[PDB]
Amino acid sequence: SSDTPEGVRSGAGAVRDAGGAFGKKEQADEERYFRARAREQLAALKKHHENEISH
Amino acid sequence: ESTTSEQSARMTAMDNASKNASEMIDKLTLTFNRTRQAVITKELIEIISGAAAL
Amino acid sequence: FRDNGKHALIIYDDLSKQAVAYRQMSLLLRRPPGREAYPGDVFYLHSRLLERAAKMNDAFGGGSLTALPVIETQAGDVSAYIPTNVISITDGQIFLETELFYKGIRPAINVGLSVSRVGSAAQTRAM
Amino acid sequence: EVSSILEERILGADTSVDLEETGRVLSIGDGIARVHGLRNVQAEEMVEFSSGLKGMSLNLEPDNVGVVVFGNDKLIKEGDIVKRTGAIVDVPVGEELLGRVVDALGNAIDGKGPIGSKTRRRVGLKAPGIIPRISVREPMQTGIKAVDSLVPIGRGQRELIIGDRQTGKTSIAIDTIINQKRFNDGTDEKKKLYCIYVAIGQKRSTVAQLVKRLTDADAMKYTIVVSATASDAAPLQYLAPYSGCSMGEYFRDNGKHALIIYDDLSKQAVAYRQMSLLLRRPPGREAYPGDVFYLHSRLLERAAKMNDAFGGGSLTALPVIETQAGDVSAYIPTNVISITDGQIFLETELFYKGIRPAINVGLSVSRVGSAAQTRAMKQVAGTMKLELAQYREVAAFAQFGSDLDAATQQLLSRGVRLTELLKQGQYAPMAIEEQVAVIYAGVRGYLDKLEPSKITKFENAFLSHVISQHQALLGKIRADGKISEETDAKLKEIVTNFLAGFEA
Amino acid sequence: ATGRIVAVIGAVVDVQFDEGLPPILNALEVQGRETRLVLEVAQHLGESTVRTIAMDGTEGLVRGQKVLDSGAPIKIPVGPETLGRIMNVIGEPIDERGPIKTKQFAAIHAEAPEFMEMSVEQEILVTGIKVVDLLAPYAKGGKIGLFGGAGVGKTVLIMELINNVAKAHGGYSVFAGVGERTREGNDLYHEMIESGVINLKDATSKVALVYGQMNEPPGARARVALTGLTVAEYFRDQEGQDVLLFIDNIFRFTQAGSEVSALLGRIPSAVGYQPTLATDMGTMQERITTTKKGSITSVQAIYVPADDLTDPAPATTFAHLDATTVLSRAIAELGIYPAVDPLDSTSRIMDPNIVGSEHYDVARGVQKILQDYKSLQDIIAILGMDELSEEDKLTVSRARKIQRFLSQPFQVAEVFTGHLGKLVPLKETIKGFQQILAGEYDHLPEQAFYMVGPIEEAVAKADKLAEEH
Ligand SMILES: Nc1ncnc2c1ncn2[C@@H]1O[C@H](COP(=O)(O)OP(=O)(O)OP(=O)(O)O)[C@@H](O)[C@H]1O
Ligand SMILES: Nc1ncnc2c1ncn2[C@@H]1O[C@H](COP(=O)(O)OP(=O)(O)O)[C@@H](O)[C@H]1O
Ligand SMILES: [Mg+2]
Ligand SMILES: [Mg+2]
């Protein structure tokens, strides 16, 4: 099919638009990884010394 | 030894994941081609039946 | 009931067979069939039924009328001809999914997709 | 003296009486009149009603005749008088049309004045046969670095610009009109080119923006624009492709050269389908009639490269076709693909990844081949086409590749830097002598140490250098045509002198 | 000239005359009804027999009712007096406040202006929405389109531009509502009295309204949009002011002509539309233009049927629009609101000679990092997030902050959200996006940009989340 202009060819971003098993396995892996980065970037954001003097 | 045992099994397990994804890719190509013909056939009947009853 | 103060509620179960039976009644009158042999005005069929379910004000009585039409879909296709004419008429949706049924949540309601206009936030004060 | 010219016209007007072959109207509706009478009308003959509209009789039936209307049917009442003109449709043609805006029937819409053309020509003529043609050899210069390198166009070839909506299909065919200014003000008579642009079903404000773009670049003194817009009637978007080839065949018949652009042909098959199904013709696939292949074939076959015994003229045709969701396997995207020679396939994915103009060279072909390139461009681009084709094999290893062979790391290194040479801003068409120098800087190996983000800044710096400081080398590739051994060494120290002290 | 009724099938009534035949596109008054029923002529059939379309219902019609003729098409009343009034298709007032008393009557069927009556100048009209002003700027006197499916926000986004643009505007404004819910024509009459745009006590109103909704017969949902842009043609032509025009919905102009078609005797085309689809669309859309006598900004909502932009009704309006704002359900189901697709919205003035070279290299810098984010999701589905390199763990985290920063809390969506209405200016939208791309905010989590205004509130919201650990 794909070895001609006529046949169907796949583009970029076609695993998420399908919405199947691999399309759901990708959304819950971008969220369970960038949930821990909202922990380490928020715990180290409390280490401002001027806020502690106000505390 | 363990980084050779691991790097050879990554070679095999990524090889059967491209055979099973190419075995699956021909079976959906036939169903795509039956369904592509069946839609040109179906919407051709609706135009003919619309003109004949008129 | 709506013109005389009181309140009512009506359920159409269902509105798909009200169009399979309007197709056949209109084919035999020798009228030309349209898409999927449905007549040309199966939008004007439903859009004058569900447009009378109003809610009136105190200068005209204050009574209301609430509908709950039912639509049957063929194997999850919510993109067919009749299941999309009504979706652009109603105010909300309750998408029952058969994938949720056999897993064990009953009433199987896809809460991610079941949207509704809340109605000027007239839910209640406690919930 | 405004009163004098008005009194001049009405004494110069012809008020003479004649005969006619009239016939009353039976039933007017949706733009299809049925006329009873008119016993001696030919097929496809122009008639004219009582109000002032004109009509072309397509169906010659036994008891009536089906005539489409060039206007709106609110002025046609049942019981009118349909007079006969006695002639098939004809357009004015000549040299006087150059620099005007015309509709599908040759009237003037720009309001400068009426056309002073003394000749007249039919729109239903035939193509030349097999004998008056000759093979295509001269180059047609577009000015795009990716077209003239990999998918060339000769002077008589038909090349299809196919792609989706909003991907620069009109912009590729609007700087090809601008680029021929450098020949059209000079002396060499056999290198000039004349451009025609046909707009089929666009809004009036868009055409009014495109004439001003071609007025700014001083490129409306050799261009004609034929506008059949969206508001105009359904048959006026059918004549307008055949009303432009009849103006592009006057330059082919008289030893000159020409160019024509149909923008676009996928809105002519729709304006013709409406005329068919209102005349009750048997439908077919996607409700198109049985002769939509015969509609597009006899329009594109009129583009030909004539030989020296007939004049040596030419006609080049570029049709635009809009696909839907990139499916070229539809009805009309497969008719026009099998007629023409090669396609230029503009994708939408490459347009947002930075590649502008977004020409996919994996699917674009041209079957005149390398026989339409000059000797200078042919020598460097023959290796570039092989170099880019080896890159597209290994493009899928770039996202995670560091553990590969040094040849494969080299094949990625040249493919990225050859791509940056192919990008080009809008309304900046180059010359072939400047094009061959930039490709020569890349295909030799003079860029594999420069950083891939700097390839654009290096190129704009290098081009402004060689215009002012090496003008006598870009006159010995323009006039020579080929690149010799003397110019091979002379170009060799130039890109080594500039690359040495560059970063400042 | 009287005539009789000889056939009634559906909404198509056949009328046989005897001595005087009225031309096509006229008005015929049915004598014998208590209401007013107007018939519009559509075809001729020979032997003095026309075939009409009815503006109201056809119940209670009998073969033999004497029908008068007008001699002219549907002439609605027009002028300055029609401001602050709701009116019908044929010009009757349905606000129940009395007769519209004006001096000018104007037919709804008229020609298009010629080629030497077009204007050519372009501008930029600032709105205050972050997705719209950055990647697809709107223009003064330019036709704007709002695409998308059912239930993604076409009516709210067209309710937002009456909130921002229409009160700061000098001239008047016209709202034509074609084939939508009759409830939502009452939440406009009651959200424009309490904001003082419609005034019920004196002569200082600034908005007219024309309504034909989805309870009407299908001959009346296809002549209301021609009645909207007839009032809006009076202000542009007979006066000189700058007019706006809001139309929702416009897919119900095409669909309402695909229902009366098969009874008029026409073979259907592709998927079910009429054969004259792209001609009467292009006959209405050539009157909504900027001429040398005025200027009409126009925003239009365009329903796309069942999320398919290759349907023949939405995919032929693209030739008549300058700025397209394609909404999407794949963005709206993430929580990103307004769900505008950045890689599918265009404009004709995204041009570094018009918006300057600083705005231009920011717009394409956003689309390039979003499109390169799309091709990276295909790898994470098999590999995972952590097995990637450190260089493309950064272009994801820069892209996810650009997705979330585009979402802005609207003003008229307060009852959905409870959040407050923000309005970011144009000079701040560019400077917000230069700093996420250059890397000046790599020390914040993703949640600090969700539903904020300018970039100043993105760090104030960052610290307030920190203290609750
Ligand atoms: N080489 C280029 N680099 C950057 N932008 C470009 C280039 N060529 C065209 N564009 C932009 O792309 C936009 C649309 O291009 P164009 O109108 O040529 O596409 P089209 O597909 O022919 O349009 P239509 O779909 O209306 O036929 C224009 O705004 C133009 O500014
Ligand atoms: N500012 C907003 N952002 C995102 N979604 C919204 C907004 N306002 C309304 N919506 C959602 O859009 C849906 C449909 O709203 P509306 O625009 O009235 O319908 P439609 O676009 O179909 O005409 C509602 O369910 C609501 O949840
Ligand atoms: Mg274009
Ligand atoms: Mg709506």
UniProtKB/TrEMBL annotation, chain E:
<feature type="binding site">
    <location>
        <position position="152"/>
    </location>
    <ligand>
        <name>ADP 1</name>
    </ligand>
</feature>
<feature type="binding site">
    <location>
        <position position="153"/>
    </location>
    <ligand>
        <name>ADP 2</name>
    </ligand>
</feature>
<comment type="function">
    <text>Catalytic subunit beta, of the mitochondrial membrane ATP synthase complex (F(1)F(0) ATP synthase or Complex V) that produces ATP from ADP in the presence of a proton gradient across the membrane which is generated by electron transport complexes of the respiratory chain. ATP synthase complex consist of a soluble F(1) head domain - the catalytic core - and a membrane F(1) domain - the membrane proton channel. These two domains are linked by a central stalk rotating inside the F(1) region and a stationary peripheral stalk.</text>
</comment>
<dbReference type="GO" id="GO:0005739">
    <property type="term" value="C:mitochondrion"/>
</dbReference>
<protein>
    <recommendedName>
        <fullName>ATP synthase subunit beta</fullName>
        <ecNumber>7.1.2.2</ecNumber>
    </recommendedName>
</protein>
<feature type="binding site">
    <location>
        <position position="151"/>
    </location>
    <ligand>
        <name>ADP 1</name>
    </ligand>
</feature>
<feature type="binding site">
    <location>
        <position position="151"/>
    </location>
    <ligand>
        <name>ADP 2</name>
    </ligand>
</feature>
<feature type="binding site">
    <location>
        <position position="154"/>
    </location>
    <ligand>
        <name>ADP 2</name>
    </ligand>
</feature>
<comment type="similarity">
    <text>Belongs to the ATPase alpha/beta chains family.</text>
</comment>
<feature type="binding site">
    <location>
        <position position="155"/>
    </location>
    <ligand>
        <name>ADP 1</name>
    </ligand>
</feature>
<feature type="binding site">
    <location>
        <position position="184"/>
    </location>
    <ligand>
        <name>Mg(2+) 2</name>
    </ligand>
</feature>
<keyword id="KW-0139">CF(1)</keyword>
<feature type="binding site">
    <location>
        <position position="184"/>
    </location>
    <ligand>
        <name>Mg(2+) 1</name>
    </ligand>
</feature>
<dbReference type="GO" id="GO:0046933">
    <property type="term" value="F:proton-transporting ATP synthase activity, rotational mechanism"/>
</dbReference>
<keyword id="KW-0066">ATP synthesis</keyword>
<feature type="domain" description="AAA+ ATPase">
    <location>
        <begin position="140"/>
        <end position="324"/>
    </location>
</feature>
<comment type="subunit">
    <text>F-type ATPases have 2 components, CF(1) - the catalytic core - and CF(0) - the membrane proton channel. CF(1) and CF(0) have multiple subunits.</text>
</comment>
<dbReference type="GO" id="GO:0042776">
    <property type="term" value="P:proton motive force-driven mitochondrial ATP synthesis"/>
</dbReference>
<feature type="binding site">
    <location>
        <position position="337"/>
    </location>
    <ligand>
        <name>ADP 2</name>
    </ligand>
</feature>
<feature type="binding site">
    <location>
        <position position="154"/>
    </location>
    <ligand>
        <name>ADP 1</name>
    </ligand>
</feature>
<keyword id="KW-0813">Transport</keyword>
<dbReference type="GO" id="GO:0005524">
    <property type="term" value="F:ATP binding"/>
</dbReference>
<feature type="binding site">
    <location>
        <position position="156"/>
    </location>
    <ligand>
        <name>ADP 2</name>
    </ligand>
</feature>
<feature type="binding site">
    <location>
        <position position="337"/>
    </location>
    <ligand>
        <name>ADP 1</name>
    </ligand>
</feature>
<keyword id="KW-0375">Hydrogen ion transport</keyword>
<keyword id="KW-0472">Membrane</keyword>
<keyword id="KW-0547">Nucleotide-binding</keyword>
<keyword id="KW-1278">Translocase</keyword>
<keyword id="KW-0406">Ion transport</keyword>
<keyword id="KW-0067">ATP-binding</keyword>
<comment type="function">
    <text>Produces ATP from ADP in the presence of a proton gradient across the membrane.</text>
</comment>
<dbReference type="GO" id="GO:0045259">
    <property type="term" value="C:proton-transporting ATP synthase complex"/>
</dbReference>
<feature type="binding site">
    <location>
        <position position="155"/>
    </location>
    <ligand>
        <name>Mg(2+) 1</name>
    </ligand>
</feature>
<feature type="binding site">
    <location>
        <position position="180"/>
    </location>
    <ligand>
        <name>Mg(2+) 1</name>
    </ligand>
</feature>
<feature type="binding site">
    <location>
        <position position="155"/>
    </location>
    <ligand>
        <name>ADP 2</name>
    </ligand>
</feature>
<feature type="binding site">
    <location>
        <position position="156"/>
    </location>
    <ligand>
        <name>ADP 1</name>
    </ligand>
</feature>
<feature type="binding site">
    <location>
        <position position="153"/>
    </location>
    <ligand>
        <name>ADP 1</name>
    </ligand>
</feature>
<keyword id="KW-0479">Metal-binding</keyword>
<feature type="binding site">
    <location>
        <position position="155"/>
    </location>
    <ligand>
        <name>Mg(2+) 2</name>
    </ligand>
</feature>
<feature type="binding site">
    <location>
        <position position="416"/>
    </location>
    <ligand>
        <name>ADP 2</name>
    </ligand>
</feature>
